[PDB]
């Protein structure tokens, strides 16, 4: 994995020694070269994972999240370069350095052989994201979110730390490869119940869980575009990756500890999708859509069937691409009308036809139009949860109505109807913006041809 | 103060700490603490204002009461053992009195009630000396008597120090009082792992001394004693706000910073000994000091501030203050976690 | 550093250079007292270094190439716009007053540094002990609010205690009629807008507050205008003074060493000029502060430390 970490670190002398008009071009070029390099991780096997060293490994779960992570950096550099034009050059290089450092943390978070190195890199990803959100977020009003981050630290990552140190003392190792063969059944006891909550609640907030999703339509709103792209595309999926690693140790107690949280997600995707029908803020609507889609990944991990893991990792990759494109479309209107109000600028297909085509395609991938991998992930999760319980199809299908309903409403409000009269700064689409939409959508459409590379280790 | 006399007095402070570190006889331990107190009293009264006289009087009374309790502990040791070796004690009453006396010298709770005041009244360099160098000698004596230290007393003092250092700094706008409640909390973190593994106690002591030295050196480099004057630093020197950012994030215990290194190891040495609840609630309380650090850097270090016109005069002059070891101490207080197995050199 | 505690250890004492000529002589008067030559005349009869009166750009004259920086960089205040509109909306009155007081504090630090480092006495014009004589004369005219006076008194309380008063204060009696006559004969169209009550308040805070408090900590010499035309009688009065008041008598090597360590650190002198008190006359917003700071960095010779600027022609920076 050291053929990826070292070029990502060499992006730091590349971004600090570059000429002042060249720092976007150079970082975009070399991060696209790293993303082309990232396809060497597709050397996967039907029995063995790709095990590089004592520190790094890659099965077919971590590999597509790595490719999506290394692909997300050039797109963030394209998306965030317009609204940093009047920024200081040194502050602009600090922004690019925090993006590069976040990629550096993520690409060795997903490959972490041992679980406390996963914990260190997992909680290391929060700091450059925090600095990007609070130094370039264009407004900061976080009176209620401070107490929620305190709740995240109390109920989340610290019990995970104590639990992983406990497994280190009990099993003697936290290597996931060793824990594949030295796993003991975790029986019914109160010690094992608090053990399960400690191993799971950090990743429950990171997904997020319904009821615990209070941070996500704030942190998505108060962020720049690169921060919202990396939150929607990668930083939610650390929770799902960590659940799919840590549920190896949590058998068979998961088979009766999943029942509350499954309810919290199965009803929760009914609520948040419905919440998207009453959103004034477009970026908040995409945030609650992200909650409504990660609820299915929570259910699919907690029911731990093969079809559910295949659908959950396909849904993670697909929703990463789709929701990142949705935030980029929301920014491509916000950079013109200077307000996130979804009822402000209407009828935009009269003014921007190709951009409305991109809105249509991102909406159709948002509502899981087949054969897109949004639908493949959605569908396999629905099949596995039907095998879990035959009634849940109702709570699936009703969600699959409301998921359609706000997806086209977001299309109908922003793009259709009568244009707003008093807005006359609606410029034509820059080639940068259309390139950003295409570099989201065309990989998402090409993955419908060959979905087997995004269906996880047990395809 | 005459610089020769200042050198002699600082060498006497160092000499008292050395006499406590090297001596085998309890009377010489007591002598080293007496020498250290007697020598440090003029360092606190360097500027000669009534706040320093109040701070020095309170420090004198606390360290003198602690020294008398230390000598009473030594004397009961002489009753029940007939000898004077600085080793384990031979009476639980001498153990309790010496643990109490060393807790008074460190400033641990419930004897914490001088550490925010005295550090407030004295300059930043003497507060640096108080919060770093004056921790070395009582931690050495606690390092040598740990076969006799009562576990319930040392854990009660430790968690009481951690809770009071956590909930005392939430209210604070003065930087010296934030450092003083941070001192009390870190001494709780050092003494709770003392009977389990004293090498991690030494690791916490050295990482704490590095981070505290970094913070007071940045404070002297910016001449800021309050939160609001610290907010006026970005318009003068922008890198200093970055350094107080990363060092305050390190002192609360963020990964992947170096100040996460000790306490994680401390939790790693408390679950080996089958204590789960105690390092759990201990780090729950450390989340509160990390949380007011994140308010004290989010609300009042990152997002840039209203300045004053006279600052535009101060743009025309560079810092001629001797920022001794400041880049080295800033690198070591942040970027040392990949070298976490260096701790074995303290075994 | 060039001077520090090691130089005091290695033998650099300042009573080794403390002769009878080492006098900090301050010459004071009203706006057109004509003392501007008299101070210079003292500097050509006692062999002292004359310092001109600190304007808006005295800090600019000390740093860089010496040339005055633009007003958006230095000052952000105007004396002439104060003369036009003393009751202005943008708060130029107290902002100009505070910038001038910081300039005087920097000049007085320069004067004590030159005195303690050379042994040569220094003649000043309207030092930090005589800046409030404008301020109250502004505040008696209602040009500023009460909060400006409270802010000035806080800054003066934390800055003037650290220093020593001058040896001699020379005051010049020029009444308001002769001041206005010299203003009308001067020819500055902004300065001809200065009123009579403002000049009278200047003279009242001279004669009632400044001199009755400096007549204890130093020795005053109060002259009229025509007898101040002769420098020889003034210098004759100076050279027969028996200095027995003020804290210059109990100055050993240690106290003067601490003072010299104070005055050579220019950021420590200017430390409490911009105290954290958000007064609207001096509060610059965050975006304007960032803008003017990024523009001051782009000024030539101002980007880095002084020996580290290739654009102005600094060599061998890689070995420095």
């Amino acid at each position: 994995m050291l053929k990826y970490i070292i070029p990502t670190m060499m992006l730091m002398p590349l971004t600090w020694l570059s000429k002042n008009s060249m720092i976007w071009i150079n970082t975009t070029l070399h991060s696209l070269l790293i993303s082309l390099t990232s396809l060497l991780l597709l050397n996967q096997f039907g029995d063995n994972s790709l095990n590089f060293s004592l520190t790094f490994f890659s099965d077919s779960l971590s590999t597509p999240l790595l490719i999506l992570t290394m692909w997300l950096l050039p797109l963030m550099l394209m998306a965030s370069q317009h609204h940093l034009s009047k920024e200081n050059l040194a502050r602009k290089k600090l922004f690019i350095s925090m993006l590069i450092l976040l990629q550096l943390f993520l690409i060795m978070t997903f490959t972490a052989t041992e679980l406390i190195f996963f914990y260190i890199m997992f909680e290391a990803t929060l700091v450059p994201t925090l600095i990007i959100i609070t130094r370039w977020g264009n407004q900061t009003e976080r009176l209620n979110a401070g107490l929620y981050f305190l709740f995240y630290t109390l109920a989340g990552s610290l019990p995970l730390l104590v639990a992983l140190i406990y497994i280190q003392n009990t099993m003697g190792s936290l290597n996931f490869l060793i824990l594949q063969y030295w796993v003991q059944p975790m029986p019914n006891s109160w010690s094992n119940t608090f053990m399960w909550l400690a191993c799971m609640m950090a990743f429950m907030v990171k997904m997020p869980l319904y009821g615990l999703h209070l941070w996500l339509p704030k942190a998505h709103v108060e962020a720049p575009i690169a921060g919202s792209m990396v939150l929607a595309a990668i930083l939610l999926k650390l929770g799902g990756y960590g659940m799919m690693r840590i549920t190896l140790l949590l058998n068979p107690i998961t088979d009766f500890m999943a029942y509350p949280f499954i309810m919290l997600s199965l009803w929760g995707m009914i609520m948040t999708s419905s919440i998207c029908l009453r959103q004034t803020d477009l970026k908040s609507l995409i945030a609650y859509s992200s909650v409504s889609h990660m609820a299915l990944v929570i259910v699919a991990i907690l029911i731990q069937t093969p079809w559910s893991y295949m659908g959950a990792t396909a849904l993670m990759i697909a929703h990463g691409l789709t929701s990142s494109m949705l935030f980029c479309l929301a920014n491509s209107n916000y950079e013109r009308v200077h307000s996130r109000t979804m009822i402000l600028a209407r009828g935009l297909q009269t003014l921007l036809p190709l951009m409305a085509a991109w809105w249509l395609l991102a909406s159709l991938t948002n509502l899981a139009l087949p054969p897109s991998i949004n639908l493949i992930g959605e569908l396999f999760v629905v099949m596995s949860t039907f095998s879990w319980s035959n009634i849940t199809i109702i709570l699936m299908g009703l969600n699959m109505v409301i998921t359609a309903l706000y997806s086209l409403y977001m299309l109908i409000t922003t793009q259709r109807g009568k244009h707003t009269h008093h807005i006359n700064n609606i410029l034509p689409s820059f080639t940068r913006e259309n390139a950003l939409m295409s570099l989201h959508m065309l990989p998402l459409l090409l993955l419908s041809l060959n979905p087997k590379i995004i269906l996880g280790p047990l395809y | 103060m005459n610089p020769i006399i200042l050198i002699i007095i600082l060498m006497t402070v160092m000499l008292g700490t050395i006499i406590v570190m090297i001596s085998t006889h309890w009377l010489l331990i007591w002598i080293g603490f007496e020498m250290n107190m007697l020598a440090i009293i003029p360092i606190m009264m360097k500027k000669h204002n009534p706040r320093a006289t109040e701070a020095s009087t309170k420090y004198f009374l606390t360290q003198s009461t602690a020294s008398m309790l230390l000598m009473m502990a030594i004397i009961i040791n002489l009753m029940f053992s007939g000898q004077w070796t600085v080793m384990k004690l031979f009476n639980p009453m001498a153990s309790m009195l010496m643990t109490m006396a060393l807790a008074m010298k460190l400033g641990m709770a419930p004897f914490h009630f001088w550490v925010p005041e005295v550090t407030q009244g004295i300059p930043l360099s003497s507060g640096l000396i108080l919060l770093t160098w004056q921790k070395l000698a009582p931690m050495s004596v606690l390092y040598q008597i740990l076969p006799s230290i009562n576990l319930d007393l040392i854990l009660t003092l430790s968690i009481l120090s951690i809770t009071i250092g956590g909930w005392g700094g939430l209210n604070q706008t003065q930087l010296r009082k934030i450092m003083a409640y941070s001192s009390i909390a870190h001494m709780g973190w050092m003494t709770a792992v003392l009977l389990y593994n004293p090498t991690m106690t030494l690791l916490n002591l050295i990482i704490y001394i590095i981070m505290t030295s970094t913070m007071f050196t940045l404070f002297m480099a910016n001449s800021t004693t309050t939160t609001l004057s610290l907010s006026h630093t970005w318009n003068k020197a922008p890198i200093m706000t970055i350094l107080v950012l990363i060092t305050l994030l390190s002192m609360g215990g963020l990964p992947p910073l170096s100040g996460f290194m000790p306490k994680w190891m401390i939790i790693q040495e408390m679950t080996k000994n089958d204590s789960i609840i105690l390092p759990t609630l201990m780090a729950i309380t450390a989340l509160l000091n990390l949380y007011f650090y994140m308010r004290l850097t989010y609300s009042t270090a990152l997002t840039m501030f209203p300045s004053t016109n006279n600052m535009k005069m101060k743009w025309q002059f560079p810092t001629t203050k001797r920022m001794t070891l400041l880049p080295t101490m800033t690198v070591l207080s942040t970027m040392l976690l990949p070298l976490t197995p260096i701790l074995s050199i303290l075994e | 550093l060039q001077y520090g505690p090691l130089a005091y250890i290695l033998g650099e004492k300042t009573t080794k250079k403390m002769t009878e000529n080492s006098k900090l002589i301050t010459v004071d008067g009203n706006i057109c007292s004509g003392k501007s030559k008299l101070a210079k005349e003292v500097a050509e009869k006692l062999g002292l270094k004359h310092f001109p009166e600190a304007g808006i750009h005295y800090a600019d004259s000390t740093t860089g190439d010496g040339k005055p920086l633009p007003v958006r960089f230095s000052g952000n205040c105007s004396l002439e716009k104060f003369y036009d509109d003393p009751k202005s909306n943008d708060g130029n009155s107290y902002r100009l007053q505070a910038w001038l007081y910081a300039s005087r504090l920097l000049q007085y630090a320069d004067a004590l540094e030159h005195l303690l480092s050379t042994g040569q006495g220094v003649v000043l014009e309207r030092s930090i002990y005589s800046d409030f004589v404008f301020l109250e004369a502004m505040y008696r005219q209602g040009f500023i609010r009460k909060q400006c006076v409270d802010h000035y008194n806080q800054v003066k309380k934390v800055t003037v205690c650290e220093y020593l008063p001058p040896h001699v204060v020379i005051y010049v009696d020029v009444p308001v009629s002769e001041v206005q006559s010299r203003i009308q004969k001067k020819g500055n169209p902004h300065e001809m807008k200065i009123t009579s009550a403002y000049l009278q308040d200047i003279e009242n805070v001279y004669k009632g507050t400044f001199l009755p408090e400096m007549s204890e900590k130093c020795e005053v010499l109060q002259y009229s205008a025509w007898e101040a035309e002769d420098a020889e009688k003034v210098v004759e009065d100076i050279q027969y003074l028996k200095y027995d008041k003020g804290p210059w008598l109990d100055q050993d090597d240690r106290k003067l060493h601490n003072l010299r360590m104070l005055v050579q650190d220019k950021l420590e002198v200017l430390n409490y000029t911009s105290i954290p008190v958000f007064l609207p006359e001096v509060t610059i917003g965050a975006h304007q502060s960032d803008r003017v700071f990024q523009e001051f960095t782009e000024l030539p010779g101002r980007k880095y430390r002084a020996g580290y600027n290739e654009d102005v022609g600094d060599k061998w920076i890689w070995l420095k």
Binding site: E141 | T173, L228, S299, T303 | P280
Partner: peptide, 19 residues
């Protein structure tokens, strides 16, 4: 339209003796 920063109202909350 630009980025928010502390005003006098936000900054004066950190200038007292206690928080």
């Amino acid at each position: 339209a630009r980025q928010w920063q502390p005003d006098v109202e936000w900054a004066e909350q950190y200038g007292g003796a206690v928080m």
